[PDB]
Amino acid sequence: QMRLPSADVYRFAEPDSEENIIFEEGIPIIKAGTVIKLIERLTYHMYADPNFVRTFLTTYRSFCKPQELLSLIIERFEIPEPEPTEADRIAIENGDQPLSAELKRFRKEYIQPVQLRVLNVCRHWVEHHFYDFERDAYLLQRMEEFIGTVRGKAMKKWVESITKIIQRKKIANITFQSSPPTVEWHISRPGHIETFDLLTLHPIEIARQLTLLESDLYRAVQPSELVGSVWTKEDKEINSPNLLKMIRHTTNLTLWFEKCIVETENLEERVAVVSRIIEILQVFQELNNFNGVLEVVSAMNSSPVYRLDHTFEQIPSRQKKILEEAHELSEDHYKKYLAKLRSINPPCVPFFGIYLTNILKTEEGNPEVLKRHGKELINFSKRRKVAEITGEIQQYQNQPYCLRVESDIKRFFENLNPMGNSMEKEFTDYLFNKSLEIEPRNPKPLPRFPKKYSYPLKSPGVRPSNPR
Amino acid sequence: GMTEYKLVVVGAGGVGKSALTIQLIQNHFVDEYDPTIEDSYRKQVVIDGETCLLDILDTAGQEEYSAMRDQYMRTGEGFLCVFAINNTKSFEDIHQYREQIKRVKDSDDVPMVLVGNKCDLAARTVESRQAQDLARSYGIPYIETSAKTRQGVEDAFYTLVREIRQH
Amino acid sequence: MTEYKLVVVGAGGVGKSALTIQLIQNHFVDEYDPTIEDSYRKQVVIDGETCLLDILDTAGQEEYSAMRDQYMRTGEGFLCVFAINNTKSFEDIHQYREQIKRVKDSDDVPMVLVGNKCDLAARTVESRQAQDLARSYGIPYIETSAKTRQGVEDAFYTLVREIRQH
Numbered sequence: 152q153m154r155l156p157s158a159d160v161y162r163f164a165e166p167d168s169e170e171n172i173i174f175e176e177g178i179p180i181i182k183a184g185t186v187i188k189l190i191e192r193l194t195y196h197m198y199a200d201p202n203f204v205r206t207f208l209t210t211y212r213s214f215c216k217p218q219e220l221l222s223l224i225i226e227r228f229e230i231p232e233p234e235p236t237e238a239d240r241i242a243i244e245n246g247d248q249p250l251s252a253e254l255k256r257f258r259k260e261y262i263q264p265v266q267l268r269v270l271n272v273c274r275h276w277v278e279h280h281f282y283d284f285e286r287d288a289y290l291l292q293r294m295e296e297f298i299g300t301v302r303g304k305a306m307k308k309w310v311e312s313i314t315k316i317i318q319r320k321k322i323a324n325i326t327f328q329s330s331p332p333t334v335e336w337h338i339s340r341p342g343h344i345e346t347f348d349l350l351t352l353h354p355i356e357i358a359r360q361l362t363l364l365e366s367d368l369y370r371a372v373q374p375s376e377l378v379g380s381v382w383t384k385e386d387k388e389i390n391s392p393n394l395l396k397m398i399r400h401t402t403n404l405t406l407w408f409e410k411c412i413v414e415t416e417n418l419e420e421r422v423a424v425v426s427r428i429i430e431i432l433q434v435f436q437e438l439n440n441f442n443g444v445l446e447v448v449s450a451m452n453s454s455p456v457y458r459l460d461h462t463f464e465q466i467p468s469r470q471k472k473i474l475e476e477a478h479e480l481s482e483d484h485y486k487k488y489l490a491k492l493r494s495i496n497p498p499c500v501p502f503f504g505i506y507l508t509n510i511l512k513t514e515e516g517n518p519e520v521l522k523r524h525g526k527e528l529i530n531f532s533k534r535r536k537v538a539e540i541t542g543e544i545q546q547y548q549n550q551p552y553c554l555r556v557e558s559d560i561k562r563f564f565e566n567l568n569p570m571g572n573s574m575e576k577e578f579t580d581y582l583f584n585k586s587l588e589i590e591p592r593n594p595k596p597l598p599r600f601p602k603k604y605s606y607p608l609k610s611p612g613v614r615p616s617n618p619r
Numbered sequence: 620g621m622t623e624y625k626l627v628v629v630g631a632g633g634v635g636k637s638a639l640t641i642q643l644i645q646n647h648f649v650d651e652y653d654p655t656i657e658d659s660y661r662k663q664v665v666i667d668g669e670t671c672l673l674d675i676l677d678t679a680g681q682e683e684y685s686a687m688r689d690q691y692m693r694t695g696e697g698f699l700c701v702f703a704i705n706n707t708k709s710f711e712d713i714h715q716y717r718e719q720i721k722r723v724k725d726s727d728d729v730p731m732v733l734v735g736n737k738c739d740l741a742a743r744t745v746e747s748r749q750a751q752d753l754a755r756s757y758g759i760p761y762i763e764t765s766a767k768t769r770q771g772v773e774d775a776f777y778t779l780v781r782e783i784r785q786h
Numbered sequence: 787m788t789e790y791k792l793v794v795v796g797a798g799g800v801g802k803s804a805l806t807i808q809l810i811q812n813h814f815v816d817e818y819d820p821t822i823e824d825s826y827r828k829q830v831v832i833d834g835e836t837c838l839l840d841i842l843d844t845a846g847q848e849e850y851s852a853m854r855d856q857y858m859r860t861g862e863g864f865l866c867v868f869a870i871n872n873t874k875s876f877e878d879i880h881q882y883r884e885q886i887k888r889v890k891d892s893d894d895v896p897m898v899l900v901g902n903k904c905d906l907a908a909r910t911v912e913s914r915q916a917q918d919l920a921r922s923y924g925i926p927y928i929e930t931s932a933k934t935r936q937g938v939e940d941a942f943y944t945l946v947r948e949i950r951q952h
């Protein structure tokens with residue numbers, strides 16, 4: 152076994168004890184520890200665990216400041232070499248070259264692995280958590296200085312590499328093999344953005360373009376917008392702008408569906424509108440856009456729309472089935488949604504709401520520290536639980552959709568603003584009054600209303616076409 | 620076999636609302652929660668000698684998904700309307716939450732309780748007398764809870780189950 | 787769902803990281819940034835069954851050779867990569883093979899031989915040469931390009947199928 156430097160010159164050589172580290176009941180899993188012990192294990196000489204690095208770098212700011220983290224890993228990097236053993240001493244006193252067997256084993260099995268892994272923490276830190284440096288230019292200078300003064304031929308390839316990566320990052324493309332399907336058009340023809348609307352665009356192309364849009368919004372959310380539950384606090388617009396942008400799109404699209412429905416007062420036309428939205432839902436399912444699916448389900452279950460019994464009576468049974476099965480995904484705390492998400496072949500667009508609730512509750516129902524023997528240990532298993540969630544989010548963010556963007560249709564949906572200049576409550580009340588108007592409460596009889604659409608209402612359907 | 624009650628928690632975000640359900644479902648002898656597992660929102664309890672199952676829907680964190688509110692509320696037989704006693708805005712939101720529940724349930728008489736929650740050691744800004752007065756005008760019970768000490772948590776949920784039983 | 791631990795090994799510069807990132811992100815990495823140790827996850831349906839792939843991307847540079855057994859211990863299956871325009875990387879394959887057998891203490895370890903950079907014309911290792919070596923190991927040989935995506939899914943999913951049958 153290797154002898155370690157003295158704990159008096161090198162703090163990371165303290166023996167493991169229940170006072171500084173606790174393991175969970177082929178690598179160990181850490182339940183809690185001091186910062187020193189967490190950083191030793193983050194850069195352990197005995198095994199590889201890159202997932203520990205992602206976990207740590209995602210969550211460390213709740214127990215350690217960035218400046219302090221850098222100090223600690225620089226200190227971990229600076230390992231004292233042992234003095235010559237007795238056999239070496241005797242060779243040197245006879246004018247011979249010592250074998251230096253212990254020094255060489257220590258360099259090869261302790262110093263080089265620990266220093267490489269310190270460098271790997273720096274690399275991951277800069278590549279995937281660069282916002283620490285964007286928000287603190289002095290932290291970046293210390294990093295650049297540290298990396299740029301590492302000497303020794305052993306570390307050289309990675310030192311040069313990390314220097315280039317830092318530079319690239321400071322001044323901050325898809326292969327498919329098969330082609331995207333052809334863009335589908337209906338009543339609105341290419342270029343005629345003025346005529347674009349729920350019934351005039353092709354429902355296949357509506358679902359596709361909304362899926363591209365919602366996928367891009369999903370893929371833009373960073374872990375920094377989630378950890379510490381910052382999307383719920385006062386500065387959420389500062390700290391979680393991508394998340395909120397994503398949520399607001401979902402909300403706007405749901406309100407647009409509701410608005411399209413209750414503002415169609417003629418019963419026959421409203422049936423065509425509801426039926427077109429259920430067809431869009433069906434393409435959402437085909438594309439694994441679960442965010443899209445729940446936009447539709449949320450709209451059908453809203454107060455203005457849910458109560459329209461006369462409208463739903465006229466919907467084809469096959470479409471009632473499609474809608475009801477989509478709604479069942481959300482029942483029992485999303486039981487069937489979760490099972491379906493974990494069984495499909497990506498790309499997909501998850502529903503983000505479940506993640507937010509799990510992160511918030513994990514952070515709220517677990518203590519920051521555990522107290523053992525008078526010592527305060529960082530509760531690391533709480534951090535690992537949060538990073539399991541952000542990790543799953545990132546996993547579904549990797550796979551891109553093989554679909555062609557249509558710039559005008561994308562623009563039309565980006566600028567959708569169903570509420571206009573109205574406040575939420577006022578607009579919400581308006582929708583419900585519209586609902587009461589077009590289908591009054593029992594026992595008041597059902598009125599008739601004039602048609603408003605001058606083009607045909609027949610759907611082109613949701614099966615794609617393919618010319619040569 | 621036993622009665623299952625579907626309870627829904629509603630209220631402004633960002634002010635400790637989720638501590639309620641967590642303090643209830645928890646072991647309540649060790650802070651060690653995993654919301655990821657089914658069994659983390661169901662709980663068997665004895666209320667006035669009658670055993671029952673509580674199913675709690677707490678979508679804390681999702682407040683910004685405001686067009687999903689109707690669908691979530693629709694699922695519930697009773698409602699906890701929660702505000703923070705150190706956040707006047709959350710108290711002023713209560714009225715619109717109650718209106719939205721009545722609309723979604725299509726009823727003027729829906730089992731609900733008003734819950735004032737103390738989430739930290741910051742200064743109170745809603746006096747309990749204001750909350751009592753608001754609860755009385757709605758004809759519902761008012762319970763104050765602490766998000767740290769488990770004080771009042773059982774009382775809030777058990778009181779809600781009594782409102783359902785007596786409805 | 788079943789989880790599979792895959793490890794990608796081979797000499798430095800042969801394209802282990804480029805292959806992996808092409809699989810994960812459908813994106814070709816043009817820069818050469820030497821790996822120390824990286825981890826990736828992918829949910830995918832293979833032969834009708836949903837899998838979770840854990841992929842460990844390893845260091846090929848000689849300076850990191852002491853850390854090799856550390857990642858071979860955990861792996862269930864190994865992608866052994868060389869570049870078809872680099873004879874020396876092909877000769878290194880033998881050493882990875884033997885170390886994997888040593889560590890896992892077995893002659894029966896799921897492996898695929900991968901000859902990468904098959905988009906380039908200037909080939910120096912012949913298919914026949916690599917195929918003969920693969921046969922003597924009892925494993926498939928697949929040529930790939932991280933740049934064009936040729937063979938990439940085929941190499942990874944073949945390794946998964948072998949771990950399934952193991």
Ligand SMILES: Nc1nc2c(ncn2[C@@H]2O[C@H](COP(=O)(O)OP(=O)(O)NP(=O)(O)O)[C@@H](O)[C@H]2O)c(=O)[nH]1
Nearest residue numbers: 798799800801802803804816820821846903931932
């Ligand atoms: N033409 C071509 N270039 C490739 C291909 N795969 C990788 N490269 C290039 O070869 C270089 C090395 O790639 P890289 O994936 O980093 O290799 P590595 O095996 O991971 N190196 P290391 O062992 O140090 O981590 C990069 O410049 C990359 O763009 C390929 O299929 N075709």
Ligand SMILES: c1ccc(C(CCNC2CCNCC2)c2ccccc2)cc1
Nearest residue numbers: 425451452456457459460462463474478
């Ligand atoms: C899922 C979501 C919503 C719907 C409704 C119908 C709900 N049915 C109930 C109405 C009240 N009475 C109880 C039944 C709907 C209404 C208009 C158009 C399409 C759908 C059904 C399934």
Ligand SMILES: [Mg+2]
Nearest residue numbers: 802803820821
């Ligand atoms: Mg690499």
